[PDB]
Amino acid sequence: MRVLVVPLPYPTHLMAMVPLCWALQASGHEVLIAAPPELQATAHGAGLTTAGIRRFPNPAFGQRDTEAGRQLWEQTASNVAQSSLDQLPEYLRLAEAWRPSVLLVDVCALIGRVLGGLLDLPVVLHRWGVDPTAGPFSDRAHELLDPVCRHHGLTGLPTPELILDPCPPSLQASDAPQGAPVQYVPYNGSGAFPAWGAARTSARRVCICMGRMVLNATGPAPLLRAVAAATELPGVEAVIAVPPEHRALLTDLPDNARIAESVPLNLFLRTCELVICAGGSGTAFTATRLGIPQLVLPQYFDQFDYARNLAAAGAGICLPDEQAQSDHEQFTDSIATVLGDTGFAAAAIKLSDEITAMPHPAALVRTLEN
Amino acid sequence: HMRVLVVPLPYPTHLMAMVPLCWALQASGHEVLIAAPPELQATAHGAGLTTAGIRRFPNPAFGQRDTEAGRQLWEQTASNVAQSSLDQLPEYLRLAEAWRPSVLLVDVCALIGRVLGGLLDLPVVLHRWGVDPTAGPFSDRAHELLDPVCRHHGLTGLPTPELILDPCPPSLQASDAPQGAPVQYVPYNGSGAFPAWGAARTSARRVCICMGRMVLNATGPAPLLRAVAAATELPGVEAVIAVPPEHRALLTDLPDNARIAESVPLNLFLRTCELVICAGGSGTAFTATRLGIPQLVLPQYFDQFDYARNLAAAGAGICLPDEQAQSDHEQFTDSIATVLGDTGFAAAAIKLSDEITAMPHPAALVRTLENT
Numbered sequence: 001m002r003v004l005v006v007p008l009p010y011p012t013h014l015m016a017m018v019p020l021c022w023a024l025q026a027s028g029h030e031v032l033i034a035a036p037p038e039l040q041a042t043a044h045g046a047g048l049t050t051a052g053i054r055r056f057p058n059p060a061f062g063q064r065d066t067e068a069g070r071q072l073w074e075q076t077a078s079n080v081a082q083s084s085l086d087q088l089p090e091y092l093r094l095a096e097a098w099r100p101s102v103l104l105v106d107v108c109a110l111i112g113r114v115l116g117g118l119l120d121l122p123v124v125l126h127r128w129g130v131d132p133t134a135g136p137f138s139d140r141a142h143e144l145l146d147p148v149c150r151h152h153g154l155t156g157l158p159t160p161e162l163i164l165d166p167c168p169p170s171l172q173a174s175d176a177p178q179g180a181p182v183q184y185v186p187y188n189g190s191g192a193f194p195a196w197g198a199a200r201t202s203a204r205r206v207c208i209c210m211g212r213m214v215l216n217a218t219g220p221a222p223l224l225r226a227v228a229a230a231t232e233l234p235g236v237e238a239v240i241a242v243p244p245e246h247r248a249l250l251t252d253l254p255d256n257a258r259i260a261e262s263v264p265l266n267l268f269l270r271t272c273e274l275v276i277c278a279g280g281s282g283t284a285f286t287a288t289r290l291g292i293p294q295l296v297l298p299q300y301f302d303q304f305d306y307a308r309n310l311a312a313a314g315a316g317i318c319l320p321d322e323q324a325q326s327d328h329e330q331f332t333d334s335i336a337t338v339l340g341d342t343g344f345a346a347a348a349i350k351l352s353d354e355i356t357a358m359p360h361p362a363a364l365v366r367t368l369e370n
Numbered sequence: 371h372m373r374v375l376v377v378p379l380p381y382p383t384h385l386m387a388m389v390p391l392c393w394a395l396q397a398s399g400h401e402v403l404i405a406a407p408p409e410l411q412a413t414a415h416g417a418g419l420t421t422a423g424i425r426r427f428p429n430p431a432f433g434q435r436d437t438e439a440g441r442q443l444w445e446q447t448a449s450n451v452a453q454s455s456l457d458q459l460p461e462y463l464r465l466a467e468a469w470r471p472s473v474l475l476v477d478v479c480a481l482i483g484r485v486l487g488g489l490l491d492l493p494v495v496l497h498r499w500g501v502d503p504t505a506g507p508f509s510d511r512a513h514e515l516l517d518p519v520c521r522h523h524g525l526t527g528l529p530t531p532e533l534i535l536d537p538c539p540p541s542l543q544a545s546d547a548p549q550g551a552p553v554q555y556v557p558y559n560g561s562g563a564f565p566a567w568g569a570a571r572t573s574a575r576r577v578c579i580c581m582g583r584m585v586l587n588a589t590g591p592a593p594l595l596r597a598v599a600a601a602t603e604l605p606g607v608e609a610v611i612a613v614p615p616e617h618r619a620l621l622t623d624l625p626d627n628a629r630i631a632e633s634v635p636l637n638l639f640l641r642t643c644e645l646v647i648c649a650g651g652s653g654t655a656f657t658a659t660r661l662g663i664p665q666l667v668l669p670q671y672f673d674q675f676d677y678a679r680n681l682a683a684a685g686a687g688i689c690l691p692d693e694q695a696q697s698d699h700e701q702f703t704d705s706i707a708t709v710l711g712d713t714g715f716a717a718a719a720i721k722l723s724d725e726i727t728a729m730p731h732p733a734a735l736v737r738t739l740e741n742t
């Protein structure tokens with residue numbers, strides 16, 4: 001196979017596919033990443049090769065039955081459809097040059113389904129996490145991209161061959177069509193094993209990690225409310241994982257607090273009792289895979305679903321909206337509840353077990369073959 | 371479930387040789403950590419891997435292990451590696467205690483990994499990067515210097531490895547290298563970008579020149595400058611020169627029929643090339659061989675003479691075996707013309723490529739490591 005990988009221009013979506021890209025390559029197949037500038041460093045930082053392509057929190061994301069919730073998801077499909085069309089010439093040329101035989105495509109990167117349709121190539125969708133694109137998004141996607149595909153002789157945007165799904169079924173949106181399961185492998189970037197990452201401490205270790213993309217969109221509030229909530233509680237040791245660009249957000253920290261700057265989470269998370277995060281699937285799924293419960297402050301897109309379904313399975317707590325997130329008493333009480341009740345860790349382990357019972361990226365390569 | 375600690379020598383290409391196996395391990399749910407000195411940090415991270423921090427030419431005597439001078443060169447290499455093993459054992463023991471690996475994946479030359487395996491009673495899987503000339507003089511000096519050491523810790527002597535993994539095409543492997551289990555070479559040449567011109571050949575005769583960073587640091591400019599002059603003088607030739615950034619200031623007044631490809635992964639374009647001119651480092655040379663591309667090899671050190679000799683005997687290239695040959699411009703030019711005028715070189719290189727493709731993929735080797 002020559003597998004051309006087409007993600008939306010968000011690091012997490014491409015990182016979700018990185019262990020499968022590596023399984024494909026360790027299996028003999030070729031792999032190229034269609035990468036806009038926002039994905040270049042991510043792609044290369046995983047040892048992969050590329051072709052160059054040129055308000056919060058908002059709970060309505062998690063409410064597709066609302067007027068506002070329907071509108072947000074349609075608006076996303078509309079923006080993506082538009083730029084898919086803008087970019088189709090470029091992607092056609094790339095496919096001419098490199099001649100892929102399969103397209104491995106982000107569920108949200110519609111460009112990929114059009115390309116599959118137009119070039120008659122089989123299309124393998126890949127979910128990055130909780131997938132809430134049924135209904136509003138997917139309907140709007142057909143209504144906008146149906147025409148171009150019919151112009152080329154198809155009935156419409158086609159249904160994909162296969163949809164790979166790293167999300168444990170238990171957490172998956174209830175209306176997401178059946179995918180083919182694949183075990184989540186926590187790829188969190190390259191980096192260094194920290195000395196203190198080897199064992200827990202007598203302290204209650206709490207990791208805060210909001211990721212780059214979230215805070216650029218939200219401003220510092222969710223990180224800084226998390227730091228305020230965690231360090232207040234007696235006996236907690238805060239581990240704060242930030243990219244270099246957000247290190248200066250952190251001014252006055254207690255003495256036992258640790259700044260972990262660009263340190264892959266999976267390297268130390270097992271020494272932690274709690275993750276405070278925003279529901280971004282790279283931090284969140286690495287925690288759940290390592291059986292660590294979470295306190296989730298969702299902001300946008302699929303984060304509210306993930307936080308809801310996580311809490312429903314008992315493996316964490318959601319702060320659902322601006323009223324909850326801005327309330328230091330609820331924030332701190334939520335941390336104290338998780339630390340004081342080992343039923344959270346127990347639920348989280350149960351989910352870790354759901355994940356590790358799933359076929360690994362290695363096993364999926366044969367599915368892709370067929 | 372394994373926790374695999376990887377113990378390379380501080381040479382990028384030895385680590386790069388293991389990158390596809392590391393990916394395979396991770397892709398099948400295991401954990402992998404690279405014990406990296408400073409020189410390895412960027413290669414490990416550049417492949418997506420995580421690290422624990424640690425810490426004249428050509429010379430034909432390297433392929434003359436049956437002579438005094440050859441034996442001395444491999445012995446000093448084993449001496450240097452044994453001495454660093456004693457320097458660094460304390461960090462490695464602290465790391466193994468910290469991370470608790472269940473198996474060590476060790477560069478054949480990284481003597482520390484065998485010591486560590488002995489001391490902590492962990493299986494050691496050795497990994498060759500290519501042709502392995504370490505039997506006899508190197509291995510003897512290793513046992514001589516480390517046997518007493520491992521005895522001082524209650525062991526038998528430097529342990530025998532549980533398993534040796536070998537990507538080298540078997541018809542090209544040193545005759546005295548002990549048997550290793552086959553693992554198919556996958557061309558990992560680093561990250562980077564698909565060049566527009568790499569899609570298809572042109573009417574020109576495309577010849578890639580790639581000497582690696584390691585080589586040019588040791589040799590200076592000569593082998594590059596020799597290959598550029600020899601290739602661009604021949605009429606009909608287009609030279610694609612793969613150079614890392616710190617070496618690009620070596621080329622000046624580049625002719626019209628020369629192209630600089632700075633850190634572009636070879637596998638991205640190599641299929642459009644009719645010949646590869648290199649020093650015989652396995653990353654360049656196995657990528658070429660994998661693609662059935664013949665090579666003109668200017669060996670300089672270590673395993674390069676053996677690879678160059680054995681590739682020439684297979685018919686899959688030409689060796690310039692020493693300084694008088696590599697600096698004979700007219701013989702160098704004639705050798706390029708010879709390969710370009712005779713498709714038998716390519717056909718011989720496809721035969722070697724069929725050996726590689728008969729080897730199990732890194733993915734299949736995951737099962738073997740689990741059973742070790």
Ligand SMILES: Cc1cn([C@H]2C[C@H](O)[C@@H](COP(=O)(O)OP(=O)(O)O)O2)c(=O)[nH]c1=O
Pocket residue numbers: 011012015187188189209210211212213214241242243260261262263264265266279280281282283284
């Ligand atoms: C800042 C930081 C991120 N990461 C990783 C965790 C995830 O794999 C990824 C961030 O993904 P994620 O949490 O999904 O979303 P976003 O990047 O918008 O926040 O980066 C670390 O492992 N360590 C760090 O210090």
Ligand SMILES: Cc1cn([C@H]2C[C@H](O)[C@@H](COP(=O)(O)OP(=O)(O)O)O2)c(=O)[nH]c1=O
Pocket residue numbers: 383386558559560580581582583584585586612613614631632633634635636637649650651652653654655
């Ligand atoms: C300089 C350069 C190297 N490479 C790769 C090919 C090999 O995988 C690796 C070099 O390794 P190798 O040829 O084994 O030895 P040395 O580094 O001393 O020449 O770097 C490229 O793909 N493109 C480049 O431009």
Ligand SMILES: OC[C@H]1O[C@H](O)[C@H](O)[C@@H](O)[C@@H]1O
Pocket residue numbers: 061062063064065066069132173174175305
């Ligand atoms: O599972 C049911 C709920 O999940 C979805 O994610 C929607 O946003 C909400 O409309 C729906 O009622």
Ligand SMILES: [Mg+2]
Pocket residue numbers: 228
């Ligand atoms: Mg405060």
Ligand SMILES: [Mg+2]
Pocket residue numbers: 540543544545
């Ligand atoms: Mg043999």
